[PDB]
Design an enzyme around this catalytic site. Sequence first.
Site, short mmCIF file in Angstrom:
data_model
loop_
_atom_site.label_atom_id
_atom_site.label_comp_id
_atom_site.label_asym_id
_atom_site.label_seq_id
_atom_site.Cartn_x
_atom_site.Cartn_y
_atom_site.Cartn_z
N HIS A 114 -89.65 72.72 79.98
CA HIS A 114 -90.91 72.12 80.37
C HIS A 114 -91.87 72.94 81.06
CE1 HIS A 114 -93.32 68.34 80.92
NE2 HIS A 114 -93.63 68.96 82.12
N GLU A 115 -91.36 73.29 82.36
CA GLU A 115 -91.84 73.94 83.47
C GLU A 115 -92.47 75.44 83.07
OE1 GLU A 115 -91.68 70.80 85.40
OE2 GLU A 115 -92.86 72.43 86.11
N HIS A 118 -95.57 74.85 81.17
CA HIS A 118 -96.81 74.88 81.96
C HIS A 118 -96.91 76.34 82.61
CE1 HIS A 118 -97.16 70.81 82.53
NE2 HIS A 118 -96.02 70.54 83.19
N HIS A 124 -99.58 68.56 79.40
CA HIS A 124 -98.75 67.51 79.16
C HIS A 124 -99.11 67.11 77.36
CE1 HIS A 124 -97.39 66.53 83.08
NE2 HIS A 124 -96.38 67.47 82.65
C1 LIG Z 1 -88.71 67.85 81.06
O1 LIG Z 1 -89.15 68.59 82.12
C2 LIG Z 1 -89.94 67.72 82.89
C3 LIG Z 1 -90.17 68.13 84.28
C4 LIG Z 1 -90.71 67.42 85.23
C5 LIG Z 1 -91.17 65.96 85.10
S1 LIG Z 1 -91.65 65.04 86.35
O2 LIG Z 1 -90.85 63.71 86.11
O3 LIG Z 1 -91.30 65.94 87.61
N1 LIG Z 1 -93.25 65.10 86.28
C6 LIG Z 1 -93.83 65.93 86.89
C7 LIG Z 1 -94.14 67.43 85.72
O4 LIG Z 1 -94.97 67.10 85.02
N2 LIG Z 1 -93.91 68.51 86.22
O5 LIG Z 1 -94.25 69.43 85.38
C8 LIG Z 1 -93.86 64.18 85.45
C9 LIG Z 1 -94.94 63.34 86.05
C10 LIG Z 1 -96.20 63.00 85.25
C11 LIG Z 1 -94.28 61.95 86.59
C12 LIG Z 1 -90.62 65.13 83.62
C13 LIG Z 1 -89.94 66.16 82.59
ZN LIG Z 2 -95.12 68.75 83.49
#
Ligand SMILES: COc1ccc(S(=O)(=O)N(CC(=O)NO)CC(C)C)cc1
Ligand SMILES: [Zn+2]
Length: 159
Positions: A114-115, A118, A124
């Site tokens: 995920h990271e 970005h 997203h």
């Molecule tokens: C699969 O990896 C992810 C990483 C962080 C998030 S998070 O809950 O920390 N979050 C922040 C995130 O986008 N950072 O990249 C979403 C946020 C909209 C609550 C959720 C899933």
């Molecule tokens: Zn994210």
Amino acid sequence: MGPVWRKHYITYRINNYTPDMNREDVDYAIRKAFQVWSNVTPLKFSKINTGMADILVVFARGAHGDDHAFDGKGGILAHAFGPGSGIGGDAHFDEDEFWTTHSGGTNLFLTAVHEIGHSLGLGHSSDPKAVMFPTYKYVDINTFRLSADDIRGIQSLYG
Ligand SMILES: COc1ccc(S(=O)(=O)N(CC(=O)NO)CC(C)C)cc1
Ligand SMILES: [Zn+2]
Ligand SMILES: [Ca+2]
Ligand SMILES: [Ca+2]
Ligand SMILES: [Ca+2]
Ligand SMILES: [Zn+2]
């Protein structure tokens, strides 16, 4: 589109290691996460052990030097900056989470994929099957794959 790396050869370095996991297991999770993206783009990733890297991987807690403090256990798990100099590209993981290999706690590999998305310039997704969908959900790691939306997203930026 948003910032992209204006090169296809991109370096990363692991600044520090969470105590939640064996060091070997952190190295493995991160390498595998970069591989996911390398496997669907022309991007090439090189790990450096010392020196200047494009993407710095950091485990930290609370307020940690950028203008985006973490929030304790739960809530925000991690965040990353899009391509750019300095903190640009960097991926930060909240040490107040319990990072894992497995389904318990928070899986580092899936969160890193995920990271890293970005760090390469993705935002997203609204596709719930996409790794870029902003909710952490454990899925079997041996069978994990990017969704069609993730691949459209990253190929729109590179290639
Ligand atoms: C699969 O990896 C992810 C990483 C962080 C998030 S998070 O809950 O920390 N979050 C922040 C995130 O986008 N950072 O990249 C979403 C946020 C909209 C609550 C959720 C899933
Ligand atoms: Zn994210
Ligand atoms: Ca950087
Ligand atoms: Ca948190
Ligand atoms: Ca921890
Ligand atoms: Zn940060």
